[PDB]
Amino acid sequence: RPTLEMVAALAGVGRGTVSRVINGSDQVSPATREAVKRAIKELGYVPNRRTDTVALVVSENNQKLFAEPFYAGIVLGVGVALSERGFQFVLATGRSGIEHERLGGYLAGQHVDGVLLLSLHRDDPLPQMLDEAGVPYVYGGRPLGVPEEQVSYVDIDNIGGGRQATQRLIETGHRRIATIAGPQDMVAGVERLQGYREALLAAGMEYDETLVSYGDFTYDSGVAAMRELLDRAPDVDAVFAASDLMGLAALRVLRASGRRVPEDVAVVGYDDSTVAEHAEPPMTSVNQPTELMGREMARLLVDRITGETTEPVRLVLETHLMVRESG
Amino acid sequence: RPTLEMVAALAGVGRGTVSRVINGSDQVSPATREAVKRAIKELGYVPNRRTDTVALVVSENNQKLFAEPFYAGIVLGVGVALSERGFQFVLATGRSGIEHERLGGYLAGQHVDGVLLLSLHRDDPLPQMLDEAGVPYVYGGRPLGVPEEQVSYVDIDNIGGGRQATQRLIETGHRRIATIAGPQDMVAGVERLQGYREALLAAGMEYDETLVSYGDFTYDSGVAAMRELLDRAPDVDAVFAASDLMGLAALRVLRASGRRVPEDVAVVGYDDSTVAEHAEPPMTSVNQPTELMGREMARLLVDRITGETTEPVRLVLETHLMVRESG
Ligand SMILES: OC[C@H]1O[C@@H](O[C@H]2[C@H](O)[C@@H](O)[C@H](O)O[C@@H]2CO)[C@H](O)[C@@H](O)[C@@H]1O
Numbered sequence: 053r054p055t056l057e058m059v060a061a062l063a064g065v066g067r068g069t070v071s072r073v074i075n076g077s078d079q080v081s082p083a084t085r086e087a088v089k090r091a092i093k094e095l096g097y098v099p100n101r102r103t104d105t106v107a108l109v110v111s112e113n114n115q116k117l118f119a120e121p122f123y124a125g126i127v128l129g130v131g132v133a134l135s136e137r138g139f140q141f142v143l144a145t146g147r148s149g150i151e152h153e154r155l156g157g158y159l160a161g162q163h164v165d166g167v168l169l170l171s172l173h174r175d176d177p178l179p180q181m182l183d184e185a186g187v188p189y190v191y192g193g194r195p196l197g198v199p200e201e202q203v204s205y206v207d208i209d210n211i212g213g214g215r216q217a218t219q220r221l222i223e224t225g226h227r228r229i230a231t232i233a234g235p236q237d238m239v240a241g242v243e244r245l246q247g248y249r250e251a252l253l254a255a256g257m258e259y260d261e262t263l264v265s266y267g268d269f270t271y272d273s274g275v276a277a278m279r280e281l282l283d284r285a286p287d288v289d290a291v292f293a294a295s296d297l298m299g300l301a302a303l304r305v306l307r308a309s310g311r312r313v314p315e316d317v318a319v320v321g322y323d324d325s326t327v328a329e330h331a332e333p334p335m336t337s338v339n340q341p342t343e344l345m346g347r348e349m350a351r352l353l354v355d356r357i358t359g360e361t362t363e364p365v366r367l368v369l370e371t372h373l374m375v376r377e378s379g
Numbered sequence: 380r381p382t383l384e385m386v387a388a389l390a391g392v393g394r395g396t397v398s399r400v401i402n403g404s405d406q407v408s409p410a411t412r413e414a415v416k417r418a419i420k421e422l423g424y425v426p427n428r429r430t431d432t433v434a435l436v437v438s439e440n441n442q443k444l445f446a447e448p449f450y451a452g453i454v455l456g457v458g459v460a461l462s463e464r465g466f467q468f469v470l471a472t473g474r475s476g477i478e479h480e481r482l483g484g485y486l487a488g489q490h491v492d493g494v495l496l497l498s499l500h501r502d503d504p505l506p507q508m509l510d511e512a513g514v515p516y517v518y519g520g521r522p523l524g525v526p527e528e529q530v531s532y533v534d535i536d537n538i539g540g541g542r543q544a545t546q547r548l549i550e551t552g553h554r555r556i557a558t559i560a561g562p563q564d565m566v567a568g569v570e571r572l573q574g575y576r577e578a579l580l581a582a583g584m585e586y587d588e589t590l591v592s593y594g595d596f597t598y599d600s601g602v603a604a605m606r607e608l609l610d611r612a613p614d615v616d617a618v619f620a621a622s623d624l625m626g627l628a629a630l631r632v633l634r635a636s637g638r639r640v641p642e643d644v645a646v647v648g649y650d651d652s653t654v655a656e657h658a659e660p661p662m663t664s665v666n667q668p669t670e671l672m673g674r675e676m677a678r679l680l681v682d683r684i685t686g687e688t689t690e691p692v693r694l695v696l697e698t699h700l701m702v703r704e705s706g
Pocket residue numbers: 120121122169170171172192193194206207208210240269294295322323340
């Protein structure tokens with residue numbers, strides 16, 4: 053079956069160019085686009101084409117699975133929902149280009165009935181690799197830069213969650229409200245920042261990028277971000293951290309700097325995890341229904357595998373705020 | 380290829396009987412053993428017979444992966460060692476009979492080049508299922524009830540670790556030294572209890588089963604075990620818990636009962652994990668080299684896959700005690 057690699061080889065370009073032609077990106081010259089399309093035609097290439105087994109792919113290094121509380125709940129829900137339907141799963145990981153290469157090549161070999169895609173980053177190649185092999189998949193987290201109507205996914209209302217977190221800080225009287233945002237190559241990072249922005253504007257407050265710092269959902273990134281916020285805006289009085297681990301980092305940086313939480317700076321996190329429960333002070337945090345998300349991911353994928361559902365399905369789940377001492 | 384199921388069907392027995400005949404167990408009558416052997420002959424059954432992919436099988440429910448600190452370090456080491464050799468892994472789980480059935484059936488279908496076996500329990504069927512399909516495997520943890528010379532494994536010197544933990548408590552003057560042992564259907568549970576026993580006897584102390592309680596490496600099992608020890612022996616002055624999570628439970632039960640740690644009861648755990656580091660008081664714990672264990676598991680398996688090694692290899696890794704406040 054013709055591959056993207058074969059198209060690139062014949063056209064004399066690389067994977068990045070062919071991937072851009074497949075997606076209809078503007079980032080290709082007309083002459084090179086036409087060369088790629090000629091190769092596609094010559095090869096008969098089509099980009100967008102039992103084992104009782106699903107691959108749950110987490111597009112991160114495996115240590116993220118154990119460090120960040122989100123993953124455990126997804127895996128719990130996936131496991132239960134697949135068990136109820138007679139399916140099992142295997143868990144696959146990897147952040148790097150070579151890991152994506154090897155995993156995409158493997159999943160093109162008819163070793164699983166379908167794939168669940170979790171924690172993907174913008175421009176990760178695995179969806180393309182699965183589409184050209186005809187392997188069905190469902191996302192956990194809407195894909196950035198893909199038209200929504202073409203894909204099936206379960207996601208959280210992270211714009212709403214970001215609004216809930218920021219509205220809490222507005223409602224308790226704060227006027228210099230910062231965020232440690234998630235990474236902007238991940239849908240939840242984009243949308244929790246969007247919710248923060250929408251809350252500020254709905255309240256008649258300014259969106260000041262001085263008060264926006266970015267992490268990558270790790271603790272260490274939260275440490276660096278909180279330190280930077282204090283340098284830029286020593287008068288910050290509240291922080292919305294877009295994950296509990298980044299919020300835990302913020303609490304520790306705030307305390308090290310001599311600021312009381314919540315009296316000087318209030319903090320709200322996201323995940324409503326044991327990280328928040330056991331923080332000092334216990335951390336207010338947005339609760340998202342991670343187990344249900346996993347269950348629904350598995351349900352939607354099995355329906356595609358069995359033919360019960362033949363059109364894309366998208367499901368968005370609501371959040372709520374869990375109030376503790378920190379904000 | 381003939382299966383155990385086919386042998387059972389032809390002989391008119393079930394899987395448990397055929398499995399016992401395959402292993403040369405005494406737990407079969409002569410007449411039934413001969414019936415099974417006739418079926419084996421009639422079918423031509425043999426019990427003991429690329430994808431760049433290894434299955435790392437954890438014979439537990441997936442939530443154990445996230446709750447117990449051991450697993451993260453194994454996965455880290457496996458991932459690095461396989462990456463260095465051009466292999467990837469998938470992670471498979473399951474405690475139940477139906478999960479073992481489905482996973483054994485899948486792994487017999489040529490979807491991986493080899494298997495790593497972690498956290499298995501005595502009489503788990505997956506090794507049998509892999510042997511009849513000719514799928515190479517390496518254990519992490521020596522198998523109970525299998526002659527050692529027939530298998531490849533990496534294990535920890537858990538007899539020595541159990542001795543280190545118990546010798547510490549003897550050396551600090553304790554005379555009523557209990558253990559919350561691991562489960563006796565798992566090699567580490569057996570061997571850490573053996574080390575406890577050997578330490579007591581080497582010191583001229585009695586092995587008193589009154590002071591031996593059993594858990595299953597979960598926190599909840601440690602809670603029940605510590606409560607039982609206090610009921611049987613209110614004068615206990617030290618506890619060796621065979622995992623950090625069971626030791627954390629012991630600390631909390633001890634404190635709830637009005638006993639000071641270490642002043643009334645000293646505690647030593649096993650795993651030298653963040654569970655021990657963050658306990659109140661910080662927990663003395665046996666350190667085992669989990670990342671190295673994972674690396675070596677992967678190395679041994681790849682050598683079998685590639686044909687570099689054609690004989691069984693067994694490796695046993697040493698432990699050391701990490702001293703903190705609790706004991
Ligand atoms: O919440 C922090 C956690 O986010 C993960 O992204 C999730 C997100 O939480 C969820 O709302 C959305 O529906 O799905 C994405 C996964 O694709 C992220 O993967 C983690 O690194 C992070 O710890």
